[PDB]
Amino acid sequence: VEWTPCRPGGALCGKLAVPVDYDRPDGDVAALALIRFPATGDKIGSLVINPGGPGESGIEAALGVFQTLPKRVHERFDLVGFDPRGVASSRPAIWCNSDADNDRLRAEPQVDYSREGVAHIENETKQFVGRCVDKMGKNFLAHVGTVNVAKDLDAIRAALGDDKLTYLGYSYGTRIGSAYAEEFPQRVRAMILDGAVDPNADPIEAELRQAKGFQDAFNNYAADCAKNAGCPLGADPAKAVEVYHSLVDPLVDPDNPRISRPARTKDPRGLSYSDAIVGTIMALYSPNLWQHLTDGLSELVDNRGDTLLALADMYMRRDSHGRYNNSGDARVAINCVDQPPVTDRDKVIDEDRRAREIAPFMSYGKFTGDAPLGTCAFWPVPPTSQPHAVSAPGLVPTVVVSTTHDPATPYKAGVDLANQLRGSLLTFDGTQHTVVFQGDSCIDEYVTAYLIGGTTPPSGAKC
Numbered sequence: 001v002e003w004t005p006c007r008p009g010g011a012l013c014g015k016l017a018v019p020v021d022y023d024r025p026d027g028d029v030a031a032l033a034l035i036r037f038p039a040t041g042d043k044i045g046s047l048v049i050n051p052g053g054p055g056e057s058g059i060e061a062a063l064g065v066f067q068t069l070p071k072r073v074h075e076r077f078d079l080v081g082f083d084p085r086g087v088a089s090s091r092p093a094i095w096c097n098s099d100a101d102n103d104r105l106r107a108e109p110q111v112d113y114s115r116e117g118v119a120h121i122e123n124e125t126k127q128f129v130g131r132c133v134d135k136m137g138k139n140f141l142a143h144v145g146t147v148n149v150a151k152d153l154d155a156i157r158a159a160l161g162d163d164k165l166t167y168l169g170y171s172y173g174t175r176i177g178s179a180y181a182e183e184f185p186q187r188v189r190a191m192i193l194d195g196a197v198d199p200n201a202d203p204i205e206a207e208l209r210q211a212k213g214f215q216d217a218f219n220n221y222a223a224d225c226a227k228n229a230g231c232p233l234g235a236d237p238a239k240a241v242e243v244y245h246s247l248v249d250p251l252v253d254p255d256n257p258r259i260s261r262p263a264r265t266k267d268p269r270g271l272s273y274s275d276a277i278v279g280t281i282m283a284l285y286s287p288n289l290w291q292h293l294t295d296g297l298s299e300l301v302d303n304r305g306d307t308l309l310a311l312a313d314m315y316m317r318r319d320s321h322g323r324y325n326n327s328g329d330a331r332v333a334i335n336c337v338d339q340p341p342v343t344d345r346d347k348v349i350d351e352d353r354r355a356r357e358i359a360p361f362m363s364y365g366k367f368t369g370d371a372p373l374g375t376c377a378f379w380p381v382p383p384t385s386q387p388h389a390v391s392a393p394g395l396v397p398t399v400v401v402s403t404t405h406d407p408a409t410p411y412k413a414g415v416d417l418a419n420q421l422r423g424s425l426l427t428f429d430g431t432q433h434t435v436v437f438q439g440d441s442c443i444d445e446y447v448t449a450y451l452i453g454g455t456t457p458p459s460g461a462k463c
Contacts (some may be wrong), residue, residue, distance in 0.1 A: 001159045003036065009066055012036045013059075016159050018085070018152045020143055028139065032152060033089035034082045035059045036160075037066055041075035045162040045189065047451070048080045048153070052171025052195070052434075054146075055331035057081075057088035068437045070448050077166065077451070082156060084176075086144040087330045094144065094330040096132040102316065102324050109273040111364040112257040113352070113371055120258075121372040129378045132333065138381055144330070145337035145384035150179035157187060164189030166451065170434045171195045171409055174400075174417065175338065179385075181392040181421070190454065191398035192447055194436040195409040196417040200389040203342060204351050206413075208358060213407035215359035217284040218244075220405060220431045224287075225294055232297035241360050247300040248276045249364065257365070263305035271305025277362060279308035282315040284407050286432045332375050337384045341376035348373055390420035397456050398423035401436055401443065408433040424456040428463050435463075 003012040013035050020028040035058075036046070051061035062081025069079060086094040105124065112120070132141060153176065157165045166189045169177040174193045181188055198206070222240035225231040232247070233240045251273040253259035262270030269275075283293035289311070296307035317325045342348055352371035356363040398421050402414020411427075418425040426446055428435045435443050442463035449455045 001034070006035070008063060009037050011063075012038070016156060018155050020085075020140060022143075022148060022151055030085050030140075031091045032082055032085065032156070033059055034080060034156070035062050037062065037074075037079040039074065039076060039078050043078065044076045044452070045078075045164070045166050046080045046160045047073065047077035047166050047168060048082070048156065048160075049168045050082075050084075050170065050173030050176055052169070052173045053087075053327060053331055054084065054172045054334040055087055055094075055327035055329070056172075057083050057325075057327070059083050059089060065437055068439065070437070070444050072448050073451060078160070080156075080160065084144075084149045084334075085152060086140070086326075086333065088325065088327070092136070092140060093326050094132070094141075094333050095135045095326060096128055096329040096332070097324070099318075099322055099324050101128075101131070102318070102328070103269065103322070106275055106312070106316070107260060107262075107269065107272055109252045109257060109260050109364075111252055111273055113368040114257075115370055117258065118370050118372045125372070125375050125378055128332075128375065129380060132329070133380055136333075141333060142337070142381040143384070144334050146175050146179050146334065147183075147384045149176050150183055153180050154184050154187060157184075162189075163187075166190045168192045168436065169194070170436070172197060174409070175199060177398075178390045178392070178417070178421065181395050181398075182390065185392045185395045188396055188398075190396065190451055191423075192401065192436060192450065193398065193417065194401040195406055195434040196400055196402055196414040197409060198413040198416045198420075199385075200387055200416070200420065201413065202387065203339060204347060208351065208354055209410050209412065210408065211355045211359040211362065213405075213410045214281060214284055215361060216405055217407035217431050218280070218359075218361045221284060221287075221290055221293065224290065228294070230298075232294060232301055244297075244361055245364075247297055248273060250303075251276055251305075252364065263300060263303050265304065265306045265309050267306070267309055269309065271300075271309050273364070275312040276300070276305065276308050278315050279311035280361070282311045284431075287430075336376040336379040337381065339385060339387055340383050341379060342374065343377045345373070390417070392421070395421065395423075396454075399426055399447065399450050399456060400424065401426045401428065401434075401447075403428040403430050403432055403435055405431040406433050407431070424459075424461070426457045426461050426463070 001014045003014045015031045019025040058081035083090040174197045223237040226237045234243045260272045283289040317327045400418040
């Protein structure tokens with residue numbers, strides 16, 4: 001790996017070729033992009049990070065992490081971000097949708113689960129899968145899975161001159177962590193995993209727990225808001241969901257649910273129902289975004305939707321010129337090969353029945369007796385991994401950071417992952433997705449002490 005400065009720090013960038021298929025290392029070849037912020041003191045090794053997603057860029061993540069990095073850590077480690085195979089700047093990058101394909105889906109209310117509606121959604125899914133294959137080919141798509149990201153991580157580890165790996169992973173990055181721990185445990189120096197994914201979970205029960213997560217985050221937000229002047233959800237938090245629907249449901253024609261009635265915005269798109277929901281979901285990632293959600297809902301009282309559209313744009317990674325990065329396309333592709341997809345219609349129909357009851361704020365109208373299959377039920381290449389309990393007996397102790405009311409990756413997953421790893425659980429009291437190197441000085445002391453001196457938080461540690 002030949003290093004070079006970038007086009008924002010003391011940063012160096014580089015590429016590293018890995019085989020696309022790890023059984024055909026003389027066959028097709030991918031190149032991973034790396035960024036590197038040199039250590040300013042006595043160097044221990046490289047701190048390698050992953051932001052999660054999947055489809056999120058680690059290079060763009062390292063630039064953000066750099067600003068909030070404890071001085072002691074920055075003294076002792078290179079901060080290294082990478083882009084996983086198929087993601088952001090790595091080549092080839094997963095592409096399925098044009099920018100116009102994305103806007104077109106986002107203009108639909110996506111709320112009609114009658115048979116016609118479900119056929120329409122399922123038809124759009126098929127054209128999507130087709131567009132993936134046409135642009136990427138069945139070979140590359142077969143190997144974007146985490147099991148192969150883990151193999152690149154060890155190629156990366158070795159390419160930076162470290163005997164063991166020091167690793168920080170958020171969210172989906174947790175799944176990369178435990179995968180690397182299973183296949184290269186003798187190469188793990190240290191590991192922080194914030195916002196856990198449990199590779200042993202049943203996919204449907206996890207989603208329902210995630211729905212519950214977000215309903216619960218919504219509850220918390222709404223209750224906070226209720227104490228504030230002029231709260232758009234009303235002063236009585238037990239009626240928030242209904243008020244919330246009184247604000248978002250008019251965005252759908254009440255006589256034909258395929259017809260969007262979008263709120264006025266300076267942007268030409270306006271605000272669709274599906275964007276309103278996605279905007280809400282985005283804000284519930286972090287209390288830093290609650291002010292924006294409140295602004296967003298306030299605008300809706302006046303039939304405006306500028307702030308919710310911006311929040312949905314943030315989530316979808318659409319910039320001000322209408323260009324999308326590949327995080328959405330890559331997200332789907334990588335998720336589809338990480339585990340067997342649900343193909344049983346009945347168990348998908350029942351999941352919709354349950355989610356409507358668990359997360360009413362997300363659900364429109366009533367249960368219809370029908371629901372669409374997820375994109376992955378139509379994936380042309382098979383999963384490269386399967387739900388199982390993490391078993392990596394000789395792994396060093398690791399730290400798993402879990403937030404009590406995390407909506408994306410709930411507290412319980414964190415607990416369970418820590419058990420399988422038989423490492424330390426560190427608890428954050430809060431309502432957000434992840435917390436490490438994000439301001440909180442208590443979390444950061446524990447993590448800095450672990451990273452440098454290998455010292456783990458004591459059983460029951462909470463912040």
